[PDB]
């Protein structure tokens, strides 16, 4: 079976060079019937083919017009791998990068690698600021009120959130993070509770951010 | 410089037959080969159809590709739907100058009644405005199938700057939640009479609106 192993930095600062390698096993990088492609995916740009390398008595490389001026895709027959570089990265280059085997003629992908997330951000380690998402009649439906905590502007991932030190799990939902144009993440955690408990039960979110060695407890009460 | 356009989502009961189309903006669909890719959440894509209708080794024969040089549109058909088939599907092709993917189609295999999202819009907290920022949080919950479209307005005008939105994902009960954020300066927040979070699901819309003068 063909295997594709991806490797390289997952964080890259703006203006620097993104550099990834795909190590092939089970097939040849000089294979006479394959092409070796790079494809990236973001929410908002969706799937985008970057380029590809192949040997037909000679190495040929095709490239997407959008990136041709900053892209390098190079084979290495001594290691049975191909690389991707992208110079002068901007936050618009944040994406999951896939290597893949495909078909020369039909620009088809055959076998997909597992992918590598690369984030482009100039941030370093920063702990979150936590703000309440206070329940009110506008978050209450029936006898049920939503309340939450907003976890802003931290780096890197991940943050984890519990409620009441883990005593409250029913009804809790912690969303995935967004990466903002600042190069920092934000997420929310919400919990749904009886609206009649709002007067008398304490709700505390516990935000953990191991990378910055920070924990924040925030009591969320009605407005 | 063409595009390939697919429905945002498509849903169908197990056992039934479903089709997902892909329309080409320009260029002849029949002149260039069309691939279809499957992608389950948190996984890399997998090829299900290549060169219009070739089915790679290991892909169930329930999966087939076809071409309609008339409507200028490729199509992926899946029969005897099983819940494993639930995924995003992307069509892909090319012309002489670029490789193009379609925008993708979420295929849901109906396991429970459909449900419109509940939406709660939280205004900026007073604590955050002291920090000189103002973030509106739109919480989108308990919907099924798990595909929505989110848009923000300031007063009555569309707002695009400062928005970030998460991809819907499963809650403990197998319905979906999603979140969206409008980041403003406190002067922007106080500058307008209202802000709105709009969510479309299954072809109808809910919009929640809050005012900085709330009150009351």
């Amino acid at each position: 079976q063909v295997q594709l192993q991806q490797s390289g930095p997952g964080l890259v600062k703006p203006s620097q060079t993104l550099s990834l390698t795909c190590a092939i096993s089970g097939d040849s990088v000089s294979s006479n019937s394959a092409a070796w492609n790079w494809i990236r995916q973001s929410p908002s740009r969706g799937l985008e083919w970057l380029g590809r390398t192949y040997y037909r008595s000679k190495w040929f490389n095709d490239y997407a017009v959008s990136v041709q001026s900053r892209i390098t895709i190079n084979p290495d027959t001594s290691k049975n791998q191909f690389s991707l570089q992208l110079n002068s990265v901007t936050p618009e280059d944040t994406a999951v990068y896939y290597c893949a085997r495909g078909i020369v003629f039909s620009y088809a992908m055959d076998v997909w690698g597992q992918g590598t997330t690369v984030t482009v951000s100039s941030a370093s380690t920063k702990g979150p600021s936590v703000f309440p998402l206070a329940p009110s009649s506008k978050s209450t439906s029936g006898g049920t009120a939503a309340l939450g905590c907003l976890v802003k502007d931290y780096f890197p991932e991940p943050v984890t959130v519990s409620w009441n030190s883990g005593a409250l799990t029913s009804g809790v939902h912690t969303f995935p993070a967004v990466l903002q144009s600042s190069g920092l993440y934000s997420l929310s955690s919400v919990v749904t509770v009886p609206s009649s408990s709002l007067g008398t039960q304490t709700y505390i979110c516990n935000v953990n951010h191991k990378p910055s060695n920070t924990k924040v407890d925030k009591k969320v009460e009605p407005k | 410089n063409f595009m390939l356009t697919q429905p945002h989502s498509v849903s169908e009961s197990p056992g039934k037959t479903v089709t997902i189309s892909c329309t080409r903006s320009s260029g002849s669909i029949a002149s260039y080969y069309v691939q279809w890719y499957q992608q389950r959440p948190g996984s890399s894509p997998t090829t299900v159809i290549y060169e219009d209708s070739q089915r790679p080794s290991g892909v169930p024969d329930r999966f087939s590709g076809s071409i309609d040089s008339s409507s200028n549109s490729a199509s992926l058909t899946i029969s005897g739907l099983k819940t494993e088939d639930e995924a995003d599907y992307y069509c892909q092709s090319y012309d002489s100058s670029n490789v193009v993917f379609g925008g993708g189609t979420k295929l849901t295999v109906l396991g429970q009644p459909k449900a419109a999202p509940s939406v709660t819009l939280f205004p900026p907290s007073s604590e955050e405005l002291q920090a000189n920022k103002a973030t509106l949080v739109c919480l989108i919950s308990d919907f099924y199938p798990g595909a929505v479209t989110v848009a923000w307005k300031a007063d009555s005008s569309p707002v695009k700057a400062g928005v970030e939105t998460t991809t819907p994902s499963k809650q403990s009960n197998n319905k979906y939640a999603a979140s969206s954020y409008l980041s403003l300066t406190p002067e922007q927040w106080k500058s307008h009479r209202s802000y709105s979070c709009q969510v479309t699901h299954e072809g109808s819309t809910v919009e929640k609106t809050v005012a900085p003068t709330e009150c009351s």
Binding site: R56, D62 | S31
Partner: peptide
């Protein structure tokens, strides 16, 4: 011996367009 790859139609050896080699 002298290697080419060329983008073409009705060519090697297919009904459609695409990239043709060696």
């Amino acid at each position: 011996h002298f290697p080419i790859c060329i983008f073409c139609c009705g060519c090697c050896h297919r009904s459609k367009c695409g990239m043709c080699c060696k």
